[PDB]
RNA sequence: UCCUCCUAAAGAGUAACGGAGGAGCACGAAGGUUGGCUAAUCCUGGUCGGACAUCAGGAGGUUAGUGCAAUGGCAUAAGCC
RNA sequence: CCAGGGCUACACACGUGCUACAAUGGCGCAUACAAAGAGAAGCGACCUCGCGAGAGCAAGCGGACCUCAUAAAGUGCGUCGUAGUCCGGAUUGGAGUCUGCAACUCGACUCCAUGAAGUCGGAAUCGCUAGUAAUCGUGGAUCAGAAUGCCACGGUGAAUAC
RNA sequence: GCCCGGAUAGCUCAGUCGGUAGAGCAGGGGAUUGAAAAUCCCCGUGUCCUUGGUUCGAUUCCGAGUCCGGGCACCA
Ligand SMILES: [Mg+2]
Ligand SMILES: [Mg+2]
Ligand SMILES: [Mg+2]
Ligand SMILES: [Mg+2]
Ligand SMILES: [Mg+2]
Ligand SMILES: [Mg+2]
Ligand SMILES: [Mg+2]
Ligand SMILES: [Mg+2]
């Protein structure tokens with residue numbers, strides 16, 4: 139809740155000053171953070187997805203949801219109902235703790251890290267990102283790794299524009315190039 | 316949240332090399348030792364180098380002089 | 382056991398372990414060990430954290446994986462854009478230092494491919 | 497390569513022709529046969545057609561080509577594949 | 579031998595060696611009840627990942643879906659757990 | 660007659676050889692035993708500097724005198740502990756040295772990194788009967804500089820031939 | 822005019838229950854041979870006749886079309 143307190147103390151002021159807001163409700167807020175791992179190789183082995191579920195639950199303290207296929211696709215040799223991905227949703231105290239841990243530890247640990255792009259707000263203020271490695275998270279021991287499987291993070295916020303999303307992230311001191 | 320499907324989530328301390336000791340809630344159990352935190356990172360500090368650094372002319376004029 | 386963003390094996394000696402980084406060899410490993418006052422018969426394990434911190438500080442004096450590859454790629458792209466003979470050989474996938482292409486050029490030509 | 501103490505190599509027949517053009521402003525394509533000479537910063541901005549063996553290949557000297565040998569920018573043998 | 583549309587002339591029905599297609603099954607759950615939910619498609623952003631797997635939003639509003647061929651219906655859903 | 664380029668190209672196929680694929684080994688330190696040859700537009704001590712190719716002053720030698728020139732493998736003490744490995748150095752980037760008016764297309768070598776393919780090789784085939792084969796270094800001609808080639812020298816040193 | 826069958830590698834054939842096409846001949850290095858044969862080793866070659874549809878998906882299932890092979894066109 140440290141980041142939530144920091145927000146409510148010293149982010150709404152900056153955002154209201156720089157956007158001429160009238161009410162606190164106009165200030166954008168972080169609705170949720172969802173982590174996704176699209177393991178498109180579970181057809182060969184089911185344990186390849188059961189280990190991904192464990193690796194995703196070791197990062198955030200929630201048992202992941204084993205998502206399935208919306209429809210059958212022949213280009214990937216799949217049929218409807220086959221589980222091919224893991225999803226985790228974070229809202230509230232765990233969301234703030236994961237955000238703080240990420241920005242404070244995991245982002246600097248990325249190999250050859252030179253910032254993050256500021257053009258991934260999909261025109262609605264929600265920020266998308268993706269990592270090519272998971273062991274950057276300190277919850278994984280190198281000697282116990284099986285394969286390397288990344289993930290994609292999406293921060294869904296109440297902001298209405300990329301400018302507002304970027305301003306909120308800058309107030310949160312998010313890496314921007 | 317459900318009781319016995321989620322992993323244990325306790326508080327822990329992550330001591331960094333630069334001395335920026337932090338306390339965060341994780342699931343590792345033991346204390347954490349960190350090499351590069353958000354304070355001792357070159358990009359966060361602002362000291363990020365580049366590649367170009369001039370070019371051919373400075374090297375030529377510093378090596379060969381008439 | 383994590384230096385410059387990559388992991389380092391623990392059962393090997395320091396000189397061999399430092400060579401696992403892209404840009405550090407035997408000479409640049411022995412120099413770092415001599416500067417940090419660390420012997421060569423010891424492994425990555427059985428060591429404290431201040432030694433690793435000063436080893437990282439001394440390694441930061443050099444160019445490593447993050448900037449090493451960027452410089453190489455920039456030089457290659459500069460040669461290709463300028464259009465020198467060396468850049469053209471790099472574009473074609475042929476030796477650039479001056480060799481024979483009639484025979485024994487497999488390293489640049491790739492695997493054998495008949496008609 | 498060339499020894500650093502000796503310095504860069506350049507022929508007078510091209511050095512005079514380029515040092516005249518520097519102040520003359522005659523940016524018409526010069527012609528030369530000496531592909532063994534280095535490139536000096538004063539040459540930048542001029543067009544020089546150098547003899548590759550059959551004809552003169554024109555090259556516009558830029559900033560990134562100083563320490564490179566001049567002959568490096570003129571193909572000698574024609575090749576287009578089999 | 580049985581089922582859907584047209585010919586079939588706005589009640590029903592109505593023929594031809596007429597024009598177009600199907601059936602000789604399946605399910606102890608694919609039935610009953612209770613509780614809850616709404617897509618096809620396209621756009622934007624994101625690691626392997628590509629026109630299309632998974633994830634976030636936005637547009638769209640049944641243009642999807644019905645265990646099966648067609649017709650008539652289905653949002654209180656007859657569709658989805 | 661002169662300048663530049665080419666004789667060193669390249670989807671390929673062939674021969675002759677080098678490095679290797681590793682512990683009968685690689686790497687680090689220490690330490691013995693040779694032979695035969697060249698040197699005046701030459702060999703180039705000692706000393707200083709550069710980690711290193713090499714740069715400077717400058718002796719000696721037309722040579723059983725001086726230089727090239729420390730022989731290596733070998734032995735002792737340690738490490739790696741069977742992995743694409745502290746094997747393999749290819750290729751590549753940067754910084755350099757030497758000769759040569761002039762090292763881009765094309766010389767040789769040094770340093771910092773990069774560390775591919777390869778884990779004993781199919782049909783088939785080659786050389787060898789003794790200081791031979793195998794293995795390890797050295798010198799010389801060519802040459803301003805440029806050999807894993809050629810010509811000679813020695814060190815360790817086999818198995819087998821009914 | 823009617824009906825049946827087939828269309829697959831350069832040639833001759835096999836195959837397929839919807840997801841992944843093989844065999845022989847032939848061709849390309851190579852080996853042996855003075856050189857060709859013969860033999861041996863190393864190889865890879867298809868949009869499965871065209872078109873439109875049910876399907877996540879068709880060389881496979883269905884409806885039409887092209888070519889070829891075959892069987893009939895009888896009682897007057
Ligand atoms: Mg050469
Ligand atoms: Mg009626
Ligand atoms: Mg009526
Ligand atoms: Mg039902
Ligand atoms: Mg209901
Ligand atoms: Mg996508
Ligand atoms: Mg229907
Ligand atoms: Mg029902």
Ligand SMILES: [Mg+2]
Pocket residue numbers: none
């Ligand atoms: Mg020749």
Ligand SMILES: [Mg+2]
Pocket residue numbers: none
């Ligand atoms: Mg040893």
Ligand SMILES: [Mg+2]
Pocket residue numbers: none
């Ligand atoms: Mg010295």
Ligand SMILES: [Mg+2]
Pocket residue numbers: none
């Ligand atoms: Mg020894």
Ligand SMILES: [Mg+2]
Pocket residue numbers: none
């Ligand atoms: Mg080695």
Ligand SMILES: [Mg+2]
Pocket residue numbers: none
């Ligand atoms: Mg090296």
Ligand SMILES: [Mg+2]
Pocket residue numbers: none
């Ligand atoms: Mg004999």
Ligand SMILES: [Mg+2]
Pocket residue numbers: 802
């Ligand atoms: Mg010579």
Ligand SMILES: [Mg+2]
Pocket residue numbers: none
């Ligand atoms: Mg001998």
Ligand SMILES: [Zn+2]
Pocket residue numbers: 331332333334335350351352353354355356
């Ligand atoms: Zn720190």
